[PDB]
Design a protein around this ligand. Structure first.
Ligand code: HEA
Ligand code: HEA
Ligand code: CU
Ligand code: CU
Ligand code: CU
Ligand code: MG
Lengths: 47, 84, 75, 514, 261, 227, 56, 75, 84
C-alpha cells in the first residue's frame, strides 16, 4: 500500500498550509450552513 | 408485541443462566404482580337453570353424586341452584 | 305459501340452523312489534317457515325454555 | 490514488472518517434550519410565512439531524473507527459493502434537499403522516423524494447493521467471549440489531404510502377502506426503536469516557450494564403506541402502553446509577470530555424523567402535540445524544488525527453550549404546560415571553457551533503531535498510536485460553 | 505486519459501492420522473448501471473465493451470519404487509360494506390455481434439497438434474402467477383488498424471480465446476433464500388467499 | 385560556382536568425528588480527594437501585390508570354535538332534534375588536350548556386535525372516516379557548376553538335562532 | 464438461499488481469504464432534471 | 328522547360502527315495514340515533349511494 | 388432512430424489389436472359503480392513465364501466 501514514496524512484534505485549510473549512462548513437560507429564499421567489 | 433484540452471538451456560435471571425470572415476577393486582374477586354469577349446563346423566362416583370434583360453592351452583 | 322455499344461506344437507334461525327471527320480530306497537304489525313469514322445518319437539321445548327463561338464544 | 483511497475504500478507518465528515457538514445544515425555526418564533408574528414554508423547515430539521448527523456520526463514524480497534480485528467483515453504506448517504441527502426545492417542499412533519402527505394535500414530487431519501438511508443503515453484527460476533480473538468485549462494542452491536428489525417495517410503511399516491392503492385512504391510523402503527413501530438506536451508542461512549477520566480500569457493574442495554433494546420494541394516545384507541390497550413504557425506567436507572458508581473512588480529571459526560448524565436524566410524565396516557391527553414533548426530546437529543457525540469527539480526536485540541478552548465551548441549550429548551416546558401547540409558525400573544427567551438561547448555541469549527481548525493549524496516552492497558484503541496505521492487527493479537 | 497472520479477507479497493450507490440515486430519482414528468430514460439508465454493478461486484466475489482462495473457514462463517441476518430484515419487510392486510380484513370499514371481502370483490378460489402454485413451490423445496444432497455426495449429474427441476418449478410458478394476475377480476385500484393483495403477493412474486436468477447463477457455477462437495456457500445461500420464499408463500396462501377471501 | 408568563397548566374548568392537575403535581414531585437526588450524588462523587480505584463489588447495591425505581413507578401508575379509566367512564350524556375538522376551520353540528350546523372560523387579527384575543377568537362560538354532560364526536372531512380545549382537559384527533368520542363537562360558565392540535397544512396555527358556556335556557334559545 | 478453474485460479493469482476487478483482462476494463461513464452521466442528467423541476 | 344513550356494544372512543349500525338497522327495518305493510309500522328509534351520531356528510353520501345503488352495505 | 407416514430412517440423496419423483412431482401433476378440470370460465362480474372500487386519485404513469397494469377487458371494467 502506497498509502501514506501519520498525522495530517490519514485525511482526504490537505493540512499542510493552515490558511489554505482555513479557506477549505470555511467553504465546507460555510456552504453547509448557508444552504437552508438560500432554499427558503428560493421558495419565497416562486409563482 | 415484539420482534426480538440484543444479540450475544456466543451461547454457553453463562448465557442461559443470564437469560434465566435476567429475563425469564423477572417476567414471572412482573406477571405475578400483575395477577396479584388484577385480583378482582368476581361476584358469583347469577343462577339461571339453563339446560345445557350443570349436566347430570349419571351421578358422580363420589360424595352425594351431585357434586363435581373441585366444587366451589361460592361460584358453582348445584343443578337446583347455589349451594348456600 | 306451499312450504318453506330454498334458502341460499342454508344450501346443504344440514338444515338445523335453518330451523333455528327462523325460530329466533320470528320471536325477535314478534317482541319488537309488541314493544313498539307500530299498529302491532306481524312477522308471520318466519313462523310459517320455522313451523314447516322445525320438528315439533324442538319448537315445544324451545317455547318452554322461553317460558321459564332458560332459553339460550338471544331474543 | 486519491480516488482509490477515498472513493474506492475498503478501510474501516477511512470510511469512518468519511462519515464524520458527512455528519459534521449535515450538522451545519440542521443547525441553520433550527435557527430559521427559532427566528420565526422569536417575535409574535410571521417572518417567513404560512405553516407550509415553516413546516417544510421543521421537517428538514428533523430528517437532517436524525438521519444525517446523529446516525452517521455515532454509528458510521465512531462505529467504523473504533469497533475493529476495540476487538482487535483487521477490519470489518464486509469492507466493500461497508463502503456502499457510506456512499448511499450523499445521494439520500440530495433527494431530501431536492424535495424542498421542487414545488412547495414537504410540510408534513418528520412523521410524514397521511392524509396530509397524500397526493391531494401534498401533490407533486416533494413527498415522493422525501420517501426515496428515506429508502436509501434505510438501505444504508441495515446493510451496516449487518456488517457490525457479523464483525462483532465473528471477528474477536478466539479466547475472548462476548462478555469480554467493551460496552461501546456491545452498545453498537445491540443498536445494530434494533436497526435490522425496525428499519424494514418503516420501508414497508412508506412504500405503502408511495403506492397510495402514485399507484392508486388505498392502504391509508378511507375511501377504499384504508386507515390513516395504520400508517401510524407502522411508522411508530420503527419510530420508537429509532430513538433508542439514537441514544445507545451514546450510552456506550459515556461509559468509556466516565471510566477513563475517573482513572478506573473498568466501569462499575459491567454485566448489569450489558443487561440494561439489552432490556432497553427489547422493551423499546413493545411500546410504540404511546405516540398515539389521542387517536381513539381502547382504554385497556391505552393502559397497557403506559405501563409497558414505564418499565423502561428501571434498566435506564441501573445505567445512570452505574456511571455514578463508576465516578466513586475515581481520580477525576476535569477534561473537556469529562465535562460533556457529566452534563449528559444530568440532562439526560431530566429529559428522560420528563418522558415518564408523558408516559401517562391520561396526562398525555393534555400534553400531547404541545411544546412539552418538544422539550422532552431536545433534552435527550440536544443534551443527550449530542453531548455524547461531543465528549466522544473531543476524547478520541487525537486517536483519529494524531493531533491534540486546545483544552481551554474546548472547555469554553462546553460553557457556551451548556448555557445555550438550557436557555433554549427550558422555557419550552412552560409553553407546553400552558398549551402552546407544536408545528405553529405563530402563537397567541401570551406565549411571547418564553418563546423570546427560547430563541435567544438558540443564538448562543449558534455561537458555540461556530467556535467549534475554529477549535478544529486551530488543532490542525498548530500541529501538536500526540506523545503519551494513559490507561492503554485497558483501552486497546490507543495501543497502535495516534493515528493508528492504515493496517492495524495485520498480525493478530495474542489472547490466552486460561 | 507486511504479511498478514489472520485468516480474514482484505478486499481490494472496488469502484462498485460508488457505482451501486449512484445506481440507487438514478433509480429513485428516475421513478420520480416516471411518476411525475412522465419519463423513463433516467429509470432505464439506473436499472442498467445497477445490473452492471451487481454483475461485476458478484463476479469479483467469485474471483476472490473460487479463483483466489480467500474464503477461509473464518471468512465463510461470517458470510453465513450475513445471509441469515439479511433474510431476517426481509422477514420483517413482509411483516409490514401482513400487518396491513390483517388490519384491514379484521376490522372492515363501512365504506367497504362493513364486511370482508368488501362488497363488489370476487376473490379467487384458493382450491384452484392458488392450490397449484402452492404444490409447485413446495415440490421445489424437496427437489432443491435433493440437489444439495447430491452436491455434498459429489454427484455432479444429479445435482445438476435436481437444480434444473427446481429452477423450472420456480419458473412454472412465475408464469402461473402471471396469468392469475391477468385473469384476476380485481386490480391494484380496487380499494384496500386489491392494494393489500397485489403488493404482498407482488413483492413475493419479485422475490421468486430474484431467487430463480440466483439458482440459475448457481446452475452455471456448477456447470463450470466452481463448487466442491464441501465449499459451496453460494448454493447454501441460494437454498436458504429459496426456502424463505416458499414459507412466505405459505403465509400468503393461508392469510390472503384462504382466510381473507 | 393562557395568560402572559404562565408556568403550569391553564385553570381547570372541568373535574377531570382538576384530577389531572393533582396527578401532575404528584408526578412532578417525584421528578423533582429523583432529579435532585442524582444531582446531589454527582456533586458528592466529584468532591473528594480520597480515592478507591481498585475493584468495587456491584450487585449488592444493584438491588436497592432496581427495586426502588420499581416501587416509585407503581406510585405513579396507580393514580394514572385510575384517572385513565375515569375518563373513559360509563356516563349518560344529555346532548351530542359533532365537530368536523376542515382545512382551516371547524364546523359543528347539533343534530339530536333539528339539523343545526355552522362554521367556526378564526377572526383575522385585522378585524378584531379591542379586547379580542389575537389568534384565538373565532366568529361563531360553539355554544353549549354549562353543568351538563355533553358527548362530543370528533372527525374530519380532509386531512388529520385535532380538536383540543386545555381548560377542560380535552384533546381528540379528528381522523377522516372515523368518529372519535369524548365527554365534555364544564362546571362553570364562560369562554374557553383551544387550538388545532395536529399539523394540517398552511393555516394549521389559524383554526382555533372557542367554547361558550351558558345556562340551558340561553343555550336552547341560541340553538333556535341558529335555525 | 470442462473444469478449468485451475487455469483461472492461476490467472487471478498472477502477481501483476492488478485489483481483482481488472485482474481478468481488457474487457474488465471496458466494462468498468462503461459502467463509470453511464453512472456519472446519469448523475449529471439527474442534477439537470432537478434544477429544471425546482422552478415553476 | 334527549340524545342517543350509551350502547354497551359500542363502549369505546371509536363510535364509527355505532353510527354505521343504526343507519343500516333503520333502513333495513324501513324496507321491511314497507314490504309487509303490517300497518306500515315505523322504526323511528334507529333514525333518531343515527341522525344524532352520524355526521351529516356521511348520511348524505350514504343516501346518495342508496339512490344510485352503489351503497356497499346490505339492506 | 394427514398426520404423516412411511418412515425410511436413512435420508441421503437417493431418499430426496425418491421423494422428488415419488411424491413432489406426482402432486404437481394431480393438482395440475385438478386445476385443468376445474377450469370453469366465470362470466365477467356484473358492473356496478361502487365508490370503494376502481379507485383513481392519480392517473397511472402509463397508457391513457386509466388502465391498470395487467388489465383484462373481459373481466376488468373501467371506472365508467366495462371496456367493450
Ligand atoms: C434519544 C432520544 C429519546 C429517548 C432516549 C427517549 C426516551 C423516552 N421517551 Fe421519548 N421522545 C423522543 C426522544 C427520546 N425519548 C422523541 C424524538 C419524541 C417525539 C417524536 C415525535 O412525536 O415527533 C419523544 C416522544 C415521547 C412520547 C410521546 C409524546 C406525545 O404525546 O407526542 C412519550 C410518551 O411515552 C415518550 C416517553 C419516553 C420515555 C418513557 C423514555 C424513557 O427512555 C426515559 C428513561 C429515562 C429515565 C426514566 C431517567 C433515568 C432513570 C432513573 C434515574 C431511574 C429512576 C426514575 C424513575 C423511577 C422514573 N417520548
Ligand atoms: C438529533 C436531533 C435534534 C437535535 C440535536 C435538535 C436540535 C435543535 N432543534 Fe430540534 N427537532 C428535532 C431534532 C433535533 N433538534 C426533531 C425530531 C423535531 C421534530 C420535528 C417535527 O415536529 O416534525 C424537532 C423539532 C424542533 C422544534 C419544534 C418546532 C415545532 O414543532 O414547531 C424546535 C423549535 O425550537 C427545534 C429546535 C431545535 C434547536 C433550537 C436545536 C438546537 O439545539 C441545535 C443546536 C446545534 C447542535 C447541537 C448541532 C451541533 C452539533 C453538530 C453540528 C455536530 C458537529 C460534528 C462533529 C463534532 C464531528 N427542533
Ligand atoms: Cu416513543
Ligand atoms: Cu387543523
Ligand atoms: Cu392543524
Ligand atoms: Mg399527533
Amino acid at each position: 500500500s502506497h498509502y501514506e501514514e501519520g498525522p495530517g496524512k490519514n485525511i482526504p484534505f490537505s493540512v499542510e498550509n493552515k490558511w489554505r485549510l482555513l479557506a477549505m473549512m470555511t467553504l465546507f462548513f460555510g456552504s453547509g450552513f448557508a444552504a437552508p437560507f438560500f432554499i427558503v429564499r428560493h421558495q419565497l421567489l416562486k409563482k | 408485541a415484539s420482534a426480538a433484540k440484543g444479540d450475544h452471538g456466543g451461547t454457553g451456560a453463562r448465557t442461559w443462566r443470564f437469560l434465566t435471571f435476567g429475563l425469564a425470572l423477572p417476567s414471572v415476577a412482573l406477571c405475578t404482580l400483575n395477577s396479584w393486582l388484577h385480583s378482582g374477586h368476581r361476584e358469583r354469577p347469577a343462577f339461571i337453570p339453563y339446560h345445557h349446563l350443570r349436566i347430570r346423566t349419571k351421578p358422580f362416583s363420589w360424595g352425594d353424586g351431585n357434586h363435581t370434583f373441585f366444587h366451589n360453592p361460592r361460584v358453582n351452583p348445584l343443578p337446583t341452584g347455589y349451594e348456600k | 305459501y306451499q312450504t318453506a322455499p330454498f334458502d341460499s344461506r342454508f344450501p346443504n344437507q344440514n338444515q338445523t340452523r335453518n330451523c333455528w334461525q327462523n325460530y329466533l327471527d320470528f320471536h325477535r320480530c314478534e317482541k319488537a312489534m309488541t314493544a313498539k306497537g307500530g299498529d302491532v304489525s306481524v312477522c308471520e313469514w318466519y313462523r310459517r317457515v320455522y313451523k314447516s322445518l322445525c320438528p315439533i319437539s324442538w319448537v315445544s321445548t324451545w317455547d318452554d325454555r322461553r317460558a321459564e327463561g332458560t332459553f339460550p338464544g338471544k331474543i | 490514488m486519491f480516488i482509490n483511497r477515498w472513493l474506492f475504500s475498503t478501510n474501516h478507518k477511512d470510511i469512518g472518517t468519511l462519515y464524520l465528515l458527512f455528519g459534521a457538514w449535515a450538522g451545519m445544515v440542521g443547525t441553520a434550519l433550527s435557527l430559521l425555526i427559532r427566528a420565526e418564533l422569536g417575535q409574535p408574528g410571521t417572518l417567513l410565512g404560512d405553516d407550509q414554508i415553516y413546516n417544510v423547515v421543521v421537517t428538514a430539521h428533523a430528517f437532517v439531524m436524525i438521519f444525517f448527523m446523529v446516525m452517521p456520526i455515532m454509528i458510521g463514524g465512531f462505529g467504523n473507527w473504533l469497533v475493529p480497534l476495540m476487538i482487535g480485528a483487521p477490519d470489518m467483515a464486509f469492507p466493500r459493502m461497508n463502503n456502499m453504506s457510506f456512499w448511499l448517504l450523499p445521494p439520500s441527502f440530495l433527494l431530501l434537499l431536492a424535495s424542498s426545492m421542487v414545488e412547495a417542499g414537504a410540510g408534513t412533519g418528520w412523521t410524514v403522516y397521511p392524509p396530509l402527505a397524500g397526493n391531494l394535500a401534498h401533490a407533486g414530487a416533494s413527498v415522493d423524494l422525501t420517501i426515496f431519501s428515506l429508502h436509501l438511508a434505510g438501505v444504508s443503515s441495515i446493510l451496516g447493521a449487518i456488517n457490525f453484527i457479523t464483525t462483532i460476533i465473528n471477528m474477536k480473538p478466539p479466547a475472548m467471549s462476548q462478555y469480554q468485549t467493551p460496552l461501546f462494542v456491545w452498545s453498537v452491536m445491540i443498536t445494530a440489531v434494533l436497526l435490522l428489525l425496525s428499519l424494514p417495517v418503516l420501508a414497508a410503511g412508506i412504500t405503502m404510502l408511495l403506492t397510495d399516491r402514485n399507484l392508486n392503492t388505498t392502504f391509508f385512504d378511507p375511501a377504499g377502506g384504508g386507515d390513516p391510523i395504520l400508517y401510524q402503527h407502522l411508522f411508530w413501530f420503527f419510530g420508537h426503536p429509532e430513538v433508542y438506536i439514537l441514544i445507545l451508542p451514546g450510552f456506550g461512549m459515556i461509559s468509556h469516557i466516565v471510566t477513563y477520566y475517573s482513572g478506573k480500569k473498568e466501569p462499575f457493574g459491567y454485566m448489569g450494564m450489558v443487561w440494561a442495554m439489552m432490556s432497553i433494546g427489547f422493551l423499546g420494541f413493545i411500546v410504540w403506541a404511546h405516540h398515539m394516545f389521542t387517536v381513539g384507541m381502547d382504554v385497556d390497550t391505552r393502559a397497557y402502553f403506559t405501563s409497558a413504557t414505564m418499565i423502561i425506567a428501571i434498566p435506564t436507572g441501573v445505567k445512570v446509577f452505574s456511571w455514578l458508581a463508576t465516578l466513586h473512588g475515581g481520580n477525576i480529571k476535569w477534561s473537556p470530555a469529562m465535562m460533556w459526560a457529566l452534563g449528559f448524565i444530568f440532562l439526560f436524566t431530566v429529559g428522560g424523567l420528563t418522558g415518564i410524565v408523558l408516559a401517562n396516557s391520561s396526562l398525555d391527553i393534555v400534553l400531547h402535540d404541545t411544546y412539552y414533548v418538544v422539550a422532552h426530546f431536545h433534552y435527550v437529543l440536544s443534551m443527550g445524544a449530542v453531548f455524547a457525540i461531543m465528549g466522544g469527539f473531543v476524547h478520541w480526536f487525537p486517536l483519529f488525527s494524531g493531533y491534540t485540541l486546545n483544552d481551554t478552548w474546548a472547555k469554553i465551548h462546553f460553557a457556551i453550549m451548556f448555557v445555550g441549550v438550557n436557555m433554549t429548551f427550558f422555557p419550552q416546558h412552560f409553553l407546553g404546560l400552558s398549551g402552546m401547540p407544536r408545528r405553529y409558525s405563530d402563537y397567541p400573544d401570551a406565549y411571547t415571553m418564553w418563546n423570546t427567551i427560547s430563541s435567544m438561547g438558540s443564538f448562543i448555541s449558534l455561537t458555540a457551533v461556530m467556535l467549534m469549527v475554529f477549535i478544529i481548525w486551530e488543532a490542525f493549524a498548530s500541529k501538536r503531535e500526540v506523545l503519551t496516552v494513559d490507561l492503554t492497558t485497558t483501552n486497546l484503541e490507543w495501543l497502535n498510536g495516534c493515528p493508528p496505521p492504515y493496517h492495524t492487527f495485520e498480525e493478530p493479537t495474542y489472547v490466552n485460553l486460561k | 505486519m507486511t504479511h498478514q497472520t489472520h485468516a480474514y479477507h482484505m478486499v481490494n479497493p472496488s469502484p462498485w459501492p460508488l457505482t451501486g450507490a449512484l445506481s440507487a440515486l438514478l433509480m429513485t430519482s428516475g421513478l420520480t420522473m416516471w411518476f411525475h414528468f412522465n419519463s423513463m430514460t433516467l429509470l432505464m439508465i439506473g436499472l442498467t448501471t445497477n445490473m452492471l454493478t451487481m454483475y461485476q461486484w458478484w463476479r469479483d466475489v467469485i474471483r476472490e473465493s473460487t479463483f483466489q482462495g480467500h474464503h477461509t473457514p473464518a471468512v465463510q462463517k461470517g458470510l453465513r451470519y450475513g445471509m441469515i441476518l439479511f433474510i431476517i430484515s426481509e422477514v420483517l419487510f413482509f411483516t409490514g404487509f401482513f400487518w396491513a392486510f390483517y388490519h384491514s380484513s379484521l376490522a372492515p370499514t363501512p365504506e367497504l360494506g362493513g364486511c370482508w371481502p368488501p362488497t363488489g370483490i370476487h376473490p379467487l378460489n384458493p382450491l384452484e390455481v392458488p392450490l397449484l402454485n402452492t404444490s409447485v413451490l413446495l415440490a421445489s423445496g424437496v427437489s432443491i434439497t435433493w440437489a444439495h444432497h447430491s452436491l455434498m455426495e459429489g454427484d455432479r449429474k444429479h445435482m445438476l438434474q435436481a437444480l434444473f427441476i427446481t429452477i423450472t418449478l420456480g419458473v412454472y410458478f412465475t408464469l402461473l402467477q402471471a396469468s392469475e394476475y391477468y385473469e384476476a377480476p380485481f386490480t391494484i385500484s380496487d380499494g384496500v383488498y386489491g392494494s393489500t393483495f397485489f403488493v404482498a403477493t407482488g413483492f413475493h412474486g419479485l422475490h421468486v424471480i430474484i431467487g430463480s436468477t440466483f439458482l440459475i447463477v448457481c446452475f452455471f457455477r456448477q456447470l463450470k465446476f466452481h463448487f466442491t462437495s464441501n465449499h459451496h456457500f453460494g448454493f447454501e445461500a441460494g437454498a436458504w433464500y429459496w426456502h424463505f420464499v416458499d414459507v412466505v408463500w405459505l403465509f400468503l396462501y393461508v392469510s390472503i388467499y384462504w382466510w381473507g377471501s | 385560556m393562557a395568560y402572559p408568563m404562565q408556568l403550569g397548566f391553564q385553570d381547570a374548568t372541568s373535574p377531570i382536568m382538576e384530577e389531572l392537575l393533582h396527578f401532575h403535581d404528584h408526578t412532578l414531585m417525584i421528578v423533582f425528588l429523583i432529579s435532585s437526588l442524582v444531582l446531589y450524588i454527582i456533586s458528592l462523587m466529584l468532591t473528594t480527594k480520597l480515592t478507591h480505584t481498585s475493584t468495587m463489588d456491584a450487585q449488592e447495591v444493584e438491588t436497592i437501585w432496581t427495586i426502588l425505581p420499581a416501587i416509585i413507578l407503581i406510585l405513579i401508575a396507580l393514580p394514572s390508570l385510575r384517572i385513565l379509566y375515569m375518563m373513559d367512564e360509563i356516563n349518560n350524556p344529555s346532548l351530542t354535538v359533532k365537530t368536523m375538522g376542515h382545512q382551516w376551520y371547524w364546523s359543528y353540528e347539533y343534530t339530536d332534534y333539528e339539523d343545526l350546523s355552522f362554521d367556526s372560523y378564526m377572526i383575522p387579527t385585522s378585524e378584531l375588536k379591542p379586547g379580542e384575543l389575537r389568534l384565538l377568537e373565532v366568529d361563531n362560538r360553539v355554544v353549549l350548556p354549562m353543568e351538563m354532560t355533553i358527548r362530543m364526536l370528533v372527525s374530519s372531512e380532509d386531512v388529520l386535525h385535532s380538536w383540543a380545549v386545555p381548560s377542560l382537559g380535552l384533546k381528540t384527533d379528528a381522523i377522516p372516516g372515523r368518529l372519535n368520542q369524548t365527554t365534555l363537562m364544564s362546571s362553570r360558565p364562560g369562554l374557553y379557548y383551544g387550538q388545532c392540535s395536529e399539523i394540517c397544512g398552511s393555516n394549521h396555527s389559524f383554526m382555533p376553538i372557542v367554547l361558550e358556556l351558558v345556562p340551558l335556557k340561553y343555550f336552547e334559545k341560541w340553538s333556535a335562532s341558529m335555525l | 464438461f470442462e473444469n478449468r478453474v485451475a487455469e483461472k485460479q492461476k490467472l487471478f493469482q498472477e502477481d501483476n499488481g492488478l485489483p481483482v476487478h481488472l485482474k481478468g483482462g481488457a474487457t474488465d476494463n471496458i466494462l468498468y469504464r462503461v459502467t463509470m461513464t453511464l453512472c456519472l452521466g446519469g448523475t449529471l442528467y439527474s442534477l439537470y432534471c432537478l434544477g429544471w423541476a425546482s422552478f415553476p
